[PDB]
Amino acid sequence: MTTDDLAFDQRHILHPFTSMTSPLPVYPVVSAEGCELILSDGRRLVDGMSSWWAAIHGYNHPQLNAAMKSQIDAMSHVMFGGITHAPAIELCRKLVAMTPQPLECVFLADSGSVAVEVAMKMALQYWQAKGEARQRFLTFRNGYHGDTFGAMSVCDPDNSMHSLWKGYLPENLFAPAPQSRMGEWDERDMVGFARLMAAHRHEIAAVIIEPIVQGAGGMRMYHPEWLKRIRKICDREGILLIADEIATGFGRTGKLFACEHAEIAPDILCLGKALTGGTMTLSATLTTREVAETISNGEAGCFMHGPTFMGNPLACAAANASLAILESGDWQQQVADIEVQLREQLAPARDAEMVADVRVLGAIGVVETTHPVNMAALQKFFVEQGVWIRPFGKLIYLMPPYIILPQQLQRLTAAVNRAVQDETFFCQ
């Protein structure tokens, strides 16, 4: 990559949630291997982010690579309308088997946001078929479910800046963010959620939440008793429960799916990110026979959705290989050890002036700061320390690949602790 390549990127290529008028520096990556990213200048960075949850097995994984190349040799893509193929069948077999018993019907899609849209549409079509006027969703404040319009309608109105779209987005119900920490249960935490359910139980199509960990909305970690109760309340009212595990799925919190922390099963489950081992985009929405059949027996005679690249053989083959790595069970002890090391190594941030809170769960470590980070200065600092850590707002957090070496994880935690010692890298 030439300097001119970088200049073109700056003036012509949009990046996630960042200004085109006041763009901040981006770092050119040429390749990646193991748990490291390699910059154009040759510098190697220990990846602390897993490219946002997904790369649970790191980069250039020989098994993932071989499975992808082998599927390319057969066919990278063929349409799924009137056609099926081995990669999709193998993936759906695994997904059905590894999730709770009732979840046995799979709708594959391309991205997390679309998977949520699918889940929401399932809930709406389900009630339409039953002849019930139910079009509201009940969710938690500080939640995040994606950027398409349906998903946006259940995201935190504040974090997701709903004022920008006031009048376009449907108005859903937002219960207070769960207070009880992943800590002791306080029954008073339920008063808000209960109030909403009482006033709106008749019109709620589904409850949608991120189980245990609220990611993009604040990297919050709450008590599993919340899920147990929500499941009981939904059962009681006949309301569908949608669990968005696009971030928590596939071992990240210490259990295969975060719903396990409460031994609960949702009616609808959304999966993405780590599904393919972070090699390429793919998502899945699973639901029950009751939901799937009810929908097909309604007026449309089917579930009204079908993306062009649905069931993409290549992505399915990548996901199959990624799931096969997890089948060994090694991730269990890898995450447990990462959790101990995160707890042990981030503890000192509790003595730092710029820190508001420290919390760890599984292979997730979060240092919340008192002031917003200076994105440009702090990103450069991390790069200079030989690590790739991507902060945002008042959060400096780590979600490393499960295969990360202890000395690599240590470089990450040391960098985090050094960043929070004084006001140098803060505000802007």
Which one, 295 or 366, has the nearer CB to a copy of itself?
Answer: 295
The Cα–Cα gap between 96 and 92 comes to 6
* Of the residues 55, 64, 103, 358, which one makes contact with Na ion according to CB under 5 A: 103
Per-residue contact string for residues 69-98; x = within reach of Na ion by CB under 5 A: ---------------------------x--
Decide: is 243 part of the binding site for Na ion (CB under 5 A). no
Site for a copy of itself, residues 44 to 63, rule: CB under 8 A? 49, 51-55, 59-60
To the nearest whole angstrom, how small is the minimum distance from the Cβ of residue 220 to a copy of itself?
19
* Of the residues 48, 143, 150, 251, which one makes contact with a copy of itself according to CB under 8 A: 150
Identify which of 357, 280, 363 has the alpha carbon closest to the alpha carbon of residue 314.
Answer: 280
DSSP H helical segments within 238-374, as ranges? 289-296, 313-327, 330-346
Query: What is residue 174's DSSP assignment?
Result: E
* Interface segment toward a copy of itself; rule CB under 8 A; list 108-116, 185-193, 220-228, 257-265: 108-116
* Of the residues 42, 83, 187, 328, which one makes contact with a copy of itself according to CB under 8 A: 83
Phi, psi of 426 (to 5 degrees): -120, 150
Identify which of 310, 312, 332 has the alpha carbon closest to the alpha carbon of residue 320.
Answer: 312
DSSP string, 216-265: TTT-EEB-THHHHHHHHHHHHHT-EEEEE-TTTTTTTTSSSSGGGGGT--
Is 329 assigned a ligand-binding role in the annotation? no
Give Cβ neighbours of residue 409 (< 8 Å, ≥ 6 apart).
338, 341, 342, 345, 400
Is 277 assigned a ligand-binding role in the annotation? no
* Of the residues 56, 117, 404, 408, which one makes contact with a copy of itself according to CB under 8 A: 117
The Cα–Cα gap between 239 and 204 comes to 7
* Of the residues 34, 44, 65, 260, which one makes contact with a copy of itself according to CB under 8 A: 65
Site for a copy of itself, residues 159 to 218, rule: CB under 8 A? 160-161, 164-165, 167-168, 170
Count residues binding a copy of itself (CB under 8 A). 117
Phi, psi of 384 (to 5 degrees): -65, -25
Instruction: Say which entry of a copy of itself, Na ion, none residue 405 contacts (CB below 5 to 8 A, set by partner kind).
Output: none
Is 307 assigned a ligand-binding role in the annotation? yes
List binding-site positions for pyridoxal 5'-phosphate.
Answer: 112-113, 244, 307-308
List binding-site positions.
Answer: 52, 112-113, 144, 244, 273, 306-308, 390
